[PDB]
Structure formats: C-alpha cells, structure tokens
Short mmCIF file of C-alpha atoms and ligand atoms in Angstrom, two decimals:
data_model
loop_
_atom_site.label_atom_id
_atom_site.label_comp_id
_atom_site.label_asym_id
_atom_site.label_seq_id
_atom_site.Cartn_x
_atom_site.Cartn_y
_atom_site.Cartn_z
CA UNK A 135 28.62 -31.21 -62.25
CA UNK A 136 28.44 -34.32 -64.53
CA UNK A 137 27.02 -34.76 -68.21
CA UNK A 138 24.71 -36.22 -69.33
CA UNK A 139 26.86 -39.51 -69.92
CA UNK A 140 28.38 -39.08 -66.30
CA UNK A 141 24.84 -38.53 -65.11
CA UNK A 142 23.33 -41.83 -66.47
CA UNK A 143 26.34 -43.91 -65.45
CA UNK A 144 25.70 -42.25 -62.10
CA UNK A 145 21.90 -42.97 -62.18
CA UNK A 146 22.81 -46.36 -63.47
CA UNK A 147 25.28 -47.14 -60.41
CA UNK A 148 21.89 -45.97 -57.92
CA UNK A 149 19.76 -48.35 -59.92
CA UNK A 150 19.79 -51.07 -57.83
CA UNK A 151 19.30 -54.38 -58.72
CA UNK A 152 15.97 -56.39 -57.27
CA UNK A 153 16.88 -59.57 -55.14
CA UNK A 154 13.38 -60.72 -53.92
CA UNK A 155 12.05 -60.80 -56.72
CA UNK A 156 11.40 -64.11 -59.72
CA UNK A 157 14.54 -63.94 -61.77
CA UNK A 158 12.13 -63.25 -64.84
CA UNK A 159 8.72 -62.01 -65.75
CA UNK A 160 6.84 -63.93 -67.60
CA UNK A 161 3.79 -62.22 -70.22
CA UNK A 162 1.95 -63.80 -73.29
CA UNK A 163 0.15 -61.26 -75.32
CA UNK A 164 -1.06 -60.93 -78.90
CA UNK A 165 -0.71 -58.60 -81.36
CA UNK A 166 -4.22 -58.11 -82.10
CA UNK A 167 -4.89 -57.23 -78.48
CA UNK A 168 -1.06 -55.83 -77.59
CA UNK A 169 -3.02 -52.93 -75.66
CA UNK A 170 -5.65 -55.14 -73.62
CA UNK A 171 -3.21 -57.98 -72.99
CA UNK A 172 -0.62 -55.83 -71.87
CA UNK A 173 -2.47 -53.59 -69.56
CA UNK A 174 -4.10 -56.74 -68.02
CA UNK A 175 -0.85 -58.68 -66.72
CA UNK A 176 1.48 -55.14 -66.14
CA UNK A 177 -1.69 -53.95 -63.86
CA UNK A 178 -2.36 -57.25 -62.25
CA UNK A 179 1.19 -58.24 -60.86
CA UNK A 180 1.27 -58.50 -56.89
CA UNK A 181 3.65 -56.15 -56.46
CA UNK A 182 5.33 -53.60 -59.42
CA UNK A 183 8.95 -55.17 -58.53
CA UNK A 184 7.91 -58.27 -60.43
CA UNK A 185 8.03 -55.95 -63.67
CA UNK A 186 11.85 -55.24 -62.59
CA UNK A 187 12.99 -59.00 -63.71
CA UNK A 188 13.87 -59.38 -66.96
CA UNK A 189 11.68 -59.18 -69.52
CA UNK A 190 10.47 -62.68 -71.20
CA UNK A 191 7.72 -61.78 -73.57
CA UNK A 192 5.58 -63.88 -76.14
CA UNK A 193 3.63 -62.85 -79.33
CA UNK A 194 0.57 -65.43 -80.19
CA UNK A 195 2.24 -68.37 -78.88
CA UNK A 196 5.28 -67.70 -81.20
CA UNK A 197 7.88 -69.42 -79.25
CA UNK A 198 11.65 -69.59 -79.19
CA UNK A 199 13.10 -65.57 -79.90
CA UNK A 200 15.71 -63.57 -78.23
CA UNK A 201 13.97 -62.04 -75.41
CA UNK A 202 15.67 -58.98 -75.53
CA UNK A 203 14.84 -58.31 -79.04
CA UNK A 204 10.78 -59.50 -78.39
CA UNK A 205 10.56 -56.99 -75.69
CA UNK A 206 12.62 -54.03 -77.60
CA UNK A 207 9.64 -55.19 -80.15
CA UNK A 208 7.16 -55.00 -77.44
CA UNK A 209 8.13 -51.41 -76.09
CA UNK A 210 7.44 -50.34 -79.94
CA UNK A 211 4.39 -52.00 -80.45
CA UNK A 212 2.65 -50.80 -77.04
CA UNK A 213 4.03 -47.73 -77.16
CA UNK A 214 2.18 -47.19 -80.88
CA UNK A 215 -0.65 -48.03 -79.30
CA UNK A 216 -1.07 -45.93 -75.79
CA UNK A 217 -0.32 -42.80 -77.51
CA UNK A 218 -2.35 -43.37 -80.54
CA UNK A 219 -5.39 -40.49 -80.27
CA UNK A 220 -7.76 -43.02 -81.53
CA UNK A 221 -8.03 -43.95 -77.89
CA UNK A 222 -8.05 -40.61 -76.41
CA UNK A 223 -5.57 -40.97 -73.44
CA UNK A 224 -3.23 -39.01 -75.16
CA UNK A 225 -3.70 -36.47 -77.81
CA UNK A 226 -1.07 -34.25 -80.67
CA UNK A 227 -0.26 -30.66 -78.55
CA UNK A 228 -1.35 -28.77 -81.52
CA UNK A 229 -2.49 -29.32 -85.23
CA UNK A 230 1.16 -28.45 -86.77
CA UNK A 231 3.20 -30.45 -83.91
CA UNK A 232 4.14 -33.88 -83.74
CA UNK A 233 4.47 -34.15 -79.83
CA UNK A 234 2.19 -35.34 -77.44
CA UNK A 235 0.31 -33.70 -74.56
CA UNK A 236 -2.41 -35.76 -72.08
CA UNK A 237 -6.38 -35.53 -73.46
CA UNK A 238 -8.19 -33.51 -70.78
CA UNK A 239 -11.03 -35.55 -71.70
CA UNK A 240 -9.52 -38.85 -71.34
CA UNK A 241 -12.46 -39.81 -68.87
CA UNK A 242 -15.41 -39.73 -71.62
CA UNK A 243 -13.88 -42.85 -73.28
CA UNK A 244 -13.06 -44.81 -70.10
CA UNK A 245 -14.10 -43.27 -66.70
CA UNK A 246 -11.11 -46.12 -65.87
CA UNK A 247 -9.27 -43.95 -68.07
CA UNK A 248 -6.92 -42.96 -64.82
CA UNK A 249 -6.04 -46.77 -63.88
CA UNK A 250 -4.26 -46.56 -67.98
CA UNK A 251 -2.38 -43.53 -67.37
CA UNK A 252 -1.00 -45.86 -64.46
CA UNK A 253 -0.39 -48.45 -66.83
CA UNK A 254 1.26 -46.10 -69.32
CA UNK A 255 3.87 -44.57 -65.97
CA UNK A 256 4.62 -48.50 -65.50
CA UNK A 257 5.91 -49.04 -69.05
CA UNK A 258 7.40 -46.01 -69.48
CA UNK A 259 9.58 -46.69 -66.46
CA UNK A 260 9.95 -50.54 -67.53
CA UNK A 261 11.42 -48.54 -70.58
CA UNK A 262 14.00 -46.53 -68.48
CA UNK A 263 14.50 -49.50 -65.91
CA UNK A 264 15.94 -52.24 -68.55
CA UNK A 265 17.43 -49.61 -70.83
CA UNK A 266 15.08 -49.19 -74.26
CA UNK A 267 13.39 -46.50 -75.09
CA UNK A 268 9.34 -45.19 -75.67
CA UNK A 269 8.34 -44.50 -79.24
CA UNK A 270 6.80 -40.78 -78.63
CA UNK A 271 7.86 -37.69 -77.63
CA UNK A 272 6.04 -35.56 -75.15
CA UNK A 273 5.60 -31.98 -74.58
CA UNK A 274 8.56 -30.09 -72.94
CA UNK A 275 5.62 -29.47 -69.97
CA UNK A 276 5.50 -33.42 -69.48
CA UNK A 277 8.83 -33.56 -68.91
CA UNK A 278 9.30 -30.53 -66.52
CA UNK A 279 5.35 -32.02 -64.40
CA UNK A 280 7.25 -35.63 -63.86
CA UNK A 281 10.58 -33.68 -62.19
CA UNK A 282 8.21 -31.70 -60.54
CA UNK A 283 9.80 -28.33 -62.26
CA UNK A 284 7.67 -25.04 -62.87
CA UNK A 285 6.11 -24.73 -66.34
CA UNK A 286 7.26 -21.52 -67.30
CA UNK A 287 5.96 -18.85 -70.36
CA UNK A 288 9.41 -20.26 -71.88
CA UNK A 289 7.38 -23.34 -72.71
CA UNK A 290 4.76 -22.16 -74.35
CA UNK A 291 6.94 -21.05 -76.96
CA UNK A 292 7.88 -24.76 -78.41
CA UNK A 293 4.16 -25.75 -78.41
CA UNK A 294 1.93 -22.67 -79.30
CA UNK A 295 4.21 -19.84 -80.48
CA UNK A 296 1.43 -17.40 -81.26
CA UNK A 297 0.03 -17.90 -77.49
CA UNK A 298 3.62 -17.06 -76.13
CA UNK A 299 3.49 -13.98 -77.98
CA UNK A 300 0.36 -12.52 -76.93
CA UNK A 301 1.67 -13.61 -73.22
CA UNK A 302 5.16 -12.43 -73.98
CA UNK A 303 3.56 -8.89 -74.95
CA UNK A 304 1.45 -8.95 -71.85
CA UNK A 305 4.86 -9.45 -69.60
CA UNK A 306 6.52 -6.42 -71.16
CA UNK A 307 4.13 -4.12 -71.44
CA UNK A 308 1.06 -2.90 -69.37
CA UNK A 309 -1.70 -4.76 -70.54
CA UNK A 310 -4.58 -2.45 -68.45
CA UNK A 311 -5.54 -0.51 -70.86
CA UNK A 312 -6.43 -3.62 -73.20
CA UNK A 313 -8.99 -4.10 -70.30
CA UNK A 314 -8.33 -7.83 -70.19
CA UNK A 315 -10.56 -10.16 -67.49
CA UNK A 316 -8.85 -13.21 -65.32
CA UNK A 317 -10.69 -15.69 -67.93
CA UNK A 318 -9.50 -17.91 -70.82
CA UNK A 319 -11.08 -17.96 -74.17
CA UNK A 320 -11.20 -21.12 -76.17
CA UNK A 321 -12.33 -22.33 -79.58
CA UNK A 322 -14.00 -25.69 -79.39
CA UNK A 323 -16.40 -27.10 -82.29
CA UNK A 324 -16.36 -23.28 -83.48
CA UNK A 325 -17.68 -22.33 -80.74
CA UNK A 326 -16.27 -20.27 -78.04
CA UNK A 327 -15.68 -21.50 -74.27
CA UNK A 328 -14.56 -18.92 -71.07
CA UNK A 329 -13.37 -20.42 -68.24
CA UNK A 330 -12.67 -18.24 -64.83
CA UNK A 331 -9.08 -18.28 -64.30
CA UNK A 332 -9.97 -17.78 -60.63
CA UNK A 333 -13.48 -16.94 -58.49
CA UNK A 334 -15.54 -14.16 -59.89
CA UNK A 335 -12.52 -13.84 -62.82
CA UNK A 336 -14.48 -12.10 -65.40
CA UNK A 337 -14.64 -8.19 -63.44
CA UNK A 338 -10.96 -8.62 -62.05
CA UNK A 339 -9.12 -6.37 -65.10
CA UNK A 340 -5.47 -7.87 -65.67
CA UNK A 341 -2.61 -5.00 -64.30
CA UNK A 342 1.18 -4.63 -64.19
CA UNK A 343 0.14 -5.81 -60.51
CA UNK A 344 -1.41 -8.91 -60.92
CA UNK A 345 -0.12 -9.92 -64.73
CA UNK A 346 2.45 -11.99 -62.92
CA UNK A 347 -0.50 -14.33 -61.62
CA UNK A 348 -2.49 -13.82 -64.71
CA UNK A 349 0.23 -15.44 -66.83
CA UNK A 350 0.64 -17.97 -64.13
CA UNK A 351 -3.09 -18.91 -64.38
CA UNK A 352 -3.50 -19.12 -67.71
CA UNK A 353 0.00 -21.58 -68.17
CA UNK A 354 -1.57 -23.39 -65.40
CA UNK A 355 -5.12 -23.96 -67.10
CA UNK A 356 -3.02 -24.74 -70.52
CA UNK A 357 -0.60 -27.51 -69.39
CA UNK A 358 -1.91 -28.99 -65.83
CA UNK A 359 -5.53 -27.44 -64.14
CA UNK A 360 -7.74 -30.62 -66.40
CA UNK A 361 -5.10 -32.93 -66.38
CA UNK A 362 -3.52 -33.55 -62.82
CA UNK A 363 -5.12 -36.45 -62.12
CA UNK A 364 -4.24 -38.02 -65.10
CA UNK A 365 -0.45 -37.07 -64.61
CA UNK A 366 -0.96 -38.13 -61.04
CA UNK A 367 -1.52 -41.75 -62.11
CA UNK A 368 1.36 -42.05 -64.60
CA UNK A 369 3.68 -40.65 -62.27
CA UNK A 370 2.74 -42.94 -59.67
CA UNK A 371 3.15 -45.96 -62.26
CA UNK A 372 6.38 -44.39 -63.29
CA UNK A 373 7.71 -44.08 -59.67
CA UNK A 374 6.96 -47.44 -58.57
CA UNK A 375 9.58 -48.50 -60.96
CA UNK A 376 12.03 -45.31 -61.17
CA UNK A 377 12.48 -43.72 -57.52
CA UNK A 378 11.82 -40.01 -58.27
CA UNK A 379 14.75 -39.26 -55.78
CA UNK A 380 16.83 -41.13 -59.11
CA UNK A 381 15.25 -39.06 -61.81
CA UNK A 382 15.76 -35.46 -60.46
CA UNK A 383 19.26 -35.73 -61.42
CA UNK A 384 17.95 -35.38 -64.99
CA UNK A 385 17.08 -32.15 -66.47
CA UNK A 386 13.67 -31.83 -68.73
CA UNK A 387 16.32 -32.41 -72.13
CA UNK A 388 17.96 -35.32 -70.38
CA UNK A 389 14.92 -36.55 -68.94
CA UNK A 390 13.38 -36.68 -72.67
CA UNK A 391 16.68 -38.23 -73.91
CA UNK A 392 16.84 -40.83 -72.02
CA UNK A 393 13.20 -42.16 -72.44
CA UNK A 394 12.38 -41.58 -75.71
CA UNK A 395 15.56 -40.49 -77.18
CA UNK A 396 15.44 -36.64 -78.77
CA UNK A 397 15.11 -35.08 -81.20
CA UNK A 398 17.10 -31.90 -81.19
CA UNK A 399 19.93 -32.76 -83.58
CA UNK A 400 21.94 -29.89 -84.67
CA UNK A 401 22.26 -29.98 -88.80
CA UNK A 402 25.55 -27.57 -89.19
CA UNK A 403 27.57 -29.76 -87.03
CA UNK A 404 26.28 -32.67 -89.21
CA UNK A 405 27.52 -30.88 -92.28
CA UNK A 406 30.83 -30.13 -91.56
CA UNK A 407 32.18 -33.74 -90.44
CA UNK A 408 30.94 -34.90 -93.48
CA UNK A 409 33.11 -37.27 -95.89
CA UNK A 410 32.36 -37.98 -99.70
CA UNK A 411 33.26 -40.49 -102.03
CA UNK A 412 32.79 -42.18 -105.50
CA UNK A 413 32.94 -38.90 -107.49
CA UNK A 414 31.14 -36.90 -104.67
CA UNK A 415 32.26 -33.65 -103.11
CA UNK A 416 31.32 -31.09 -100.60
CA UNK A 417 29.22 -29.32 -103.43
CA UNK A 418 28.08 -31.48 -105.13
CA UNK A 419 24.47 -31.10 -106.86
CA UNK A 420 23.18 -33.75 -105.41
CA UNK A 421 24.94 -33.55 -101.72
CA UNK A 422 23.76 -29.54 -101.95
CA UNK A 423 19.89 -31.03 -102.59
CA UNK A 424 20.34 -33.60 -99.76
CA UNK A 425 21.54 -31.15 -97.16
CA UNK A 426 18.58 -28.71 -98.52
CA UNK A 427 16.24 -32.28 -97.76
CA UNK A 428 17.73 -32.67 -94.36
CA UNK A 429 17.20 -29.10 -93.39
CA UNK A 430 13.38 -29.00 -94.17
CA UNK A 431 12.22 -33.10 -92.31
CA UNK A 432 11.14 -33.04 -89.01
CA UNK A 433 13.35 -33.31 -86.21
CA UNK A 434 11.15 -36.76 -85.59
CA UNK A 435 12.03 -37.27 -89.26
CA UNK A 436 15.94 -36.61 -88.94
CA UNK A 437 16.25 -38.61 -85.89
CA UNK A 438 14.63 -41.58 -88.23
CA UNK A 439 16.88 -40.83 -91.19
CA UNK A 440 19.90 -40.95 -88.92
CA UNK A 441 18.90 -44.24 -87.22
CA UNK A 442 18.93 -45.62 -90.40
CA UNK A 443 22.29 -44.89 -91.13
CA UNK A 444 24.03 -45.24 -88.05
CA UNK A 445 21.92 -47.82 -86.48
CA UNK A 446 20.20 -46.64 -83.35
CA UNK A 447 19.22 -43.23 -82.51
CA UNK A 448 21.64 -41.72 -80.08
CA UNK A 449 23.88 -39.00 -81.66
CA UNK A 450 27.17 -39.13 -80.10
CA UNK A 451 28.74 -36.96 -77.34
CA UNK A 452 30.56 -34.14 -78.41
CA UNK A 453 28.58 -33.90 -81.73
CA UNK A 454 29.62 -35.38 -84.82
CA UNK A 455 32.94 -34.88 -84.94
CA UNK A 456 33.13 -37.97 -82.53
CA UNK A 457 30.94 -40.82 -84.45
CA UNK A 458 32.16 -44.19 -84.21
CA UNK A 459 31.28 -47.50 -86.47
CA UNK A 460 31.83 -50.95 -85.74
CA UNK A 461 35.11 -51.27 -86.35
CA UNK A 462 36.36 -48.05 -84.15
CA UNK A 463 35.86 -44.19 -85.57
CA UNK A 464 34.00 -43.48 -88.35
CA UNK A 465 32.71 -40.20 -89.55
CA UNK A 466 29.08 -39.57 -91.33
CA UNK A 467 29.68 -39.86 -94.76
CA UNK A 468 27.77 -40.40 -98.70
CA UNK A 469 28.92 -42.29 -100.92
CA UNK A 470 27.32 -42.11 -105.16
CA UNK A 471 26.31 -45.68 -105.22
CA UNK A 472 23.72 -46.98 -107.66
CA UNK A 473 21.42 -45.59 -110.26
CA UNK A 474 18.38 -43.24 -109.58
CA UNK A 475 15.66 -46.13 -110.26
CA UNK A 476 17.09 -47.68 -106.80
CA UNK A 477 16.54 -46.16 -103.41
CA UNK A 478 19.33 -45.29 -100.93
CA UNK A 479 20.77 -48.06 -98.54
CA UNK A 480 22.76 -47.66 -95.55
CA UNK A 481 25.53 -49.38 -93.86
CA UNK A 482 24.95 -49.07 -90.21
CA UNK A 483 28.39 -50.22 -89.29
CA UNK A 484 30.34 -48.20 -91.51
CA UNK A 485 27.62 -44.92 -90.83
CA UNK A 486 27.59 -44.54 -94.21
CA UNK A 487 25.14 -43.32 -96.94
CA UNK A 488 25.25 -45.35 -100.43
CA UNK A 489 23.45 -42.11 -102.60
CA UNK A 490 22.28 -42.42 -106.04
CA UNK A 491 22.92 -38.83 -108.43
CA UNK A 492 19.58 -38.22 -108.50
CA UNK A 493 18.48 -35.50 -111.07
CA UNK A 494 15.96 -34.03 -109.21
CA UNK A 495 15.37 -32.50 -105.46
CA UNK A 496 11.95 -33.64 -105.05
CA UNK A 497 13.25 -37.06 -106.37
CA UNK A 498 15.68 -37.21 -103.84
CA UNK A 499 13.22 -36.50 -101.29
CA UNK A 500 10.78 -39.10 -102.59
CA UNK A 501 13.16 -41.73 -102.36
CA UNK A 502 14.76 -40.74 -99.52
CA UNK A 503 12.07 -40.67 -97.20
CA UNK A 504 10.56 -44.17 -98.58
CA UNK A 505 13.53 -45.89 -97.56
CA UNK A 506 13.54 -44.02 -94.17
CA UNK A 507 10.19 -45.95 -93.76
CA UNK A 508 11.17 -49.18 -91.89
CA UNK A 509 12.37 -48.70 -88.57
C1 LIG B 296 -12.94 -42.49 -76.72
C2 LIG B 296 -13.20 -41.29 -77.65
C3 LIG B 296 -12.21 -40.14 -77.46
O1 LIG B 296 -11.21 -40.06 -78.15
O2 LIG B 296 -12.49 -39.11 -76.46
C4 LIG B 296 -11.47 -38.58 -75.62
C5 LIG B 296 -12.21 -43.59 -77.48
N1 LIG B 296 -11.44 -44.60 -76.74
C6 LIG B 296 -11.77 -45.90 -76.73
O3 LIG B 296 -12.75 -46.32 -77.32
C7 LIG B 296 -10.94 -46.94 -76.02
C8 LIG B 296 -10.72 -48.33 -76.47
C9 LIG B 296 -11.28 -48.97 -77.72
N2 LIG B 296 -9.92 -48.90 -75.55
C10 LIG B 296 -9.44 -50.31 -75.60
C11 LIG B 296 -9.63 -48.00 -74.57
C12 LIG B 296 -8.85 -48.13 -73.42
C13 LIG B 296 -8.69 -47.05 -72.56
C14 LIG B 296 -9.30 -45.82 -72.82
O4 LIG B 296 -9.11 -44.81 -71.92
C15 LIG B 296 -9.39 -43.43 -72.16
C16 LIG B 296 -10.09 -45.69 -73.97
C17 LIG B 296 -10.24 -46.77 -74.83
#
C-alpha cells in the first residue's frame, strides 16, 4: 500500500474539480461577528458545491488582499471560535488534555445547536477541500466516528488513562467477584449520576461472559451514546464537501494529519540531525537546557515551536534527517546569536534557530515560549 504522501496525492488525483459551479465564492464577514457571519452565508448557499470555488473572503469591508492568505486567515479565526467552550458545541476531553471532544449538552445553549455542528462538518471539509488546515485537534474517537471505525478500549488510553486501567483490569481478569452492575457512575457538580448501560442494568452483575459487552457499553456511553446526533450533523456537513468513499483511504493518524496537522512529533529523531554553530556544540549548557525545554511542552506546544522555525507545521517524511529550506536541504539547527536580554528569532528558510546563552533553564523557557507566541 501507499504512504501517507502517496495516499494524499492519490486522494488529491480523486478530488475532482467542480465545473457547474461560479468560478468563486464570494463572503463578507466581520471580525466582531466571524462566527454569526460565517455560519449565516456557509449555511445559506443553494447548494454546498458553491463552497467548492475558490475562496474570496472579506474582513469589514477591508478590500484589496491576497485571497488565499484572507481565507488561510479565515480558517484560523473561525476555527478559534467554533471550538471555543465558551459556546458549548465543543468542549476540552478532560481537565489535563488539550484535545477536543463534542459537548453532550450542546442543545441547552442552542436547541439549533445541531444545524452548527453542520456548519462546523462544512468548514472543516472547506479546510481539507482547498488544502489548509483547522486550528484544533480532536479526540482520537472523532477521528475513528467520521471513518466510521470501532472505538476501541485502546482509545481510552490517550484521553482518560486511569479509566483504561480500571477497564484494562476488568478485560484480564474476572471481574464477578467485584460484583459490578451494567451501569456507569459519574461525577457531575459533586454529585454522583448512574446511568443503565442497558434495560434493567443495575441487577445484571458484570462476568467473564458478558465483560466483552460491558466494556463495549460503557466505551459506547463515553465517546458516542449523547452525542450521535451531533456527529451526525458534522459528518453530513463534512461529506457534502469530502465524499466519504475519498476519506476512508485515510487512517485515524492520517485523517488527523491532514486536517489539522498533528501533533505526534518524535523528539530523539529531532536531536540527532541536529547542527550547531557560533561556539555551540552537541553539549552544550545551553543546547542540553533547550532539549530538556523541548522534552517537557506540549505536543500542541512543539508543533508551534517548530512552525516557527521551519515555517509551517508539517514535519517532513522520513523524519528529520530529510528537512529541506528554501534553497534545497537543510537540517534543524541552533545557532548562539544575541545576548540573553533578546528573545530567540528564527529563520524559516534556513530552519534555523538564532539562540541566545542563556544562564538559566527557566530563562530559556520564559523566553522561548514568548516568542513561540505569534503564529
Ligand atoms: C451555552 C452554555 C453552555 O456552554 O452549555 C453547553 C452557551 N452558548 C452560547 O451562548 C452561544 C452563543 C453566544 N452563540 C452565538 C452560539 C451559537 C451556537 C450555540 O450552539 C450550542 C451556542 C451559542
């Protein structure tokens, strides 16, 4: 089979192009109202094809800008918006995560609320159709529901570990003698909520028999039972841009890669096709103190260090042995530029680092991350 390169090519090739269709679509929006203004026009189109021209977008009757920077602009600043909480469409998987999952109660804010996870499928495959990418990353469950893939106990793992543990024990041992019931527990408001995991739940004790369903169940009422309607819409918004024959080639990895752009960058193989220069060295101080920084950020906050040095996010195939500048090759590499009073710059077309000797590690990782703060 292909790669993922030879798969998107390939998925690019079955892409085809839209003849009946304007040979633009036109929207005028404003900032203020990015959310309102854009969910009016995308949802009001006569047919979802129109959204397939190319993209010629306005800000507040700002006119005269490279369209395909204003909508590459656009796809950040709606995408900031639809998956902010504040609204409650979609909400953080779990207080120490950083991905997103859908709200199950998405309908107390807006009983419209499923005509916006519509919306949200549109733009999200307006994102994949013209080639820029979603500012967000989803749960691995997301991902697996929109290729129509089983969520398995393997996913549970990446969004509540200690869950997959008490579910993991379950599996490989027999769990009858804990005298467990076919109901969830759940703390809400410190309070405590059961919910039948299936009719008359609560006197059906969990058995080497039946554990297979129970774990079933209980993934099921986790990641899909209160939110299927609300996946329903934004795959249907999705698919009227992206034919969901065209997506399965994608795995759940790829899928995520080429929407939002992981996410999963591996540090070791950074390290090692490293280059130094201007005085430093493989072990150097402060190159040992940056590589201790890099270890400890976010894989959100990697991927946003390494856009700013490279220039987009999008770590090259074969790992980083293979990175390439303007100019042709060029390897990741720091070079001790500067004076500790001034932050770090980067030279996107020369993937290069320009690093003060800073004489701290939690200096270098104040100033660091502040000029990390842009894109
Ligand atoms: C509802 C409270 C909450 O988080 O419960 C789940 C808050 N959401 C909104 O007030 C809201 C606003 C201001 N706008 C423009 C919305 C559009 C769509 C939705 O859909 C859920 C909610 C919105």
């Amino acid at each position: 089979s292909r790669d993922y390169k030879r798969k998107y090519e390939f998925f690019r090739r079955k892409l085809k192009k839209q003849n009946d269709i304007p040979n633009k679509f036109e929207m005028k929006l404003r900032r203020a109202t990015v959310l309102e203004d854009s969910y009016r026009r995308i949802m009001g189109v006569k047919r979802a094809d129109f959204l397939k021209a190319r993209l010629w977008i306005e800000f507040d009757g700002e006119k005269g800008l490279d369209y395909g920077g204003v909508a590459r602009e656009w796809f950040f600043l709606i995408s900031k918006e639809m998956f902010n909480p504040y609204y409650g469409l979609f909400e953080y998987s779990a207080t120490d995560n950083y991905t997103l999952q859908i709200n199950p109660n998405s309908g107390l804010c807006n009983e419209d609320h499923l005509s916006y996870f519509k919306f949200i499928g549109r733009v999200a495959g307006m994102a994949v159709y013209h080639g820029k990418l979603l500012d967000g990353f989803f749960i691995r469950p997301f991902y697996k529901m929109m290729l129509h893939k089983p969520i398995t106990l393997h996913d549970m793992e990446s969004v509540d570990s200690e869950y997959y543990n008490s579910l993991r024990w379950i599996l490989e041992n027999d769990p009858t003698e804990l005298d467990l019931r076919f109901i969830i527990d759940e703390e809400l408001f410190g309070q405590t909520h059961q919910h039948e995991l299936k009719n008359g739940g609560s006197e059906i004790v969990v058995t080497n028999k039946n554990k297979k369903e129970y774990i079933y169940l209980v993934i099921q009422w986790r990641f899909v039972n209160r939110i299927q309607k609300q996946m329903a819409a934004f795959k249907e918004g999705f698919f009227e841009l992206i034919p969901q024959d065209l997506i399965k080639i994608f795995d759940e990895n790829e899928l995520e890669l080429l929407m939002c752009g992981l996410g999963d960058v591996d540090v070791n193989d950074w390290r090692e096709h490293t280059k130094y220069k201007n005085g430093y060295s493989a072990n150097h101080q402060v190159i040992q103190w940056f590589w201790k920084a890099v270890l400890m950020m976010d894989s959100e906050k990697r991927i946003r260090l390494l856009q700013f040095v490279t220039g987009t996010s999008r770590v090259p195939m074969n790992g980083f042995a293979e990175l390439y500048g303007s100019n042709g090759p060029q390897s990741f590499t720091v070079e001790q530029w500067g004076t500790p009073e001034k932050l770090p710059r980067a030279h996107t077309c020369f993937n290069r680092l320009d690093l003060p000797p800073y004489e701290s590690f939690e200096e270098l990782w104040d100033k660091l991350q502040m000029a990390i703060e842009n894109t």
